[PDB]
Design a protein around this ligand. Structure first.
Ligand SMILES: CO[C@]1(C(=O)O)C[C@H](O)[C@@H](NC(C)=O)[C@H]([C@H](O)[C@H](O)CO)O1
Length: 161
């Protein structure tokens, strides 16, 4: 029933499908850009991290990002975004997670990602021009779930595979 797992790759996912990502290591989970007004990379941060600056490879280049994770026990997925090519990266929409799963979707002129704290997650979005043609690079195994089955994706984010 569940469509996957697919191996790490860059492709152009259809609109109104969730890319359910199953990372195993801390670090960059997924990234995508329209090359004009949106870059988004999701970073997975370890439980229990006091403010510190780390180096991440985002869109092929080293970037210094100051990260934290206030939770003693839960993972933190962070959307690191910029809105112009040479802009600074800013952090939004944290998901605190036990199951270690995330998902991203292209929908209605935006990129959506999961947010909040498992097991009661919600979603939030980032307006993105030419949203439909955004290529996503997965750095881990992933699955594909139609928006019609969002309740299934939400259950996976909340409770695991
Ligand atoms: C312009 O308004 C919005 C948008 O994109 O539609 C509203 C949206 O709710 C908000 N999402 C979050 C997680 O904060 C988003 C980001 O602040 C911004 O895209 C970051 O670049 O801004």
């Amino acid at each position: 029933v569940l469509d996957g797992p697919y191996q790490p790759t860059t492709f152009n996912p259809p609109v109104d499908y969730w890319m359910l990502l199953a990372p195993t290591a801390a670090g960059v989970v997924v990234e995508g850009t329209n090359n004009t007004d949106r870059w988004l990379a999701t970073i997975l941060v370890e439980p229990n991290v006091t403010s510190e600056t780390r180096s991440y490879t985002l869109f092929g280049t080293q970037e210094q990002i100051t990260i934290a994770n206030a939770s003693q026990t839960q993972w933190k997925f962070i959307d690191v975004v910029k809105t112009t090519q040479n802009g600074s990266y800013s952090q939004y929409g944290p998901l605190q997670s036990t199951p270690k799963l995330y998902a991203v979707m292209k929908h209605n002129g935006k990129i959506y990602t999961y947010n909040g704290e498992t097991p009661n997650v919600t979603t939030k979005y980032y307006s993105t021009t030419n949203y439909d043609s955004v290529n996503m690079t997965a750095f881990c195994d992933f699955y594909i779930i139609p928006r019609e089955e969002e309740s299934t994706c939400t259950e996976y984010i909340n409770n695991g595979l």
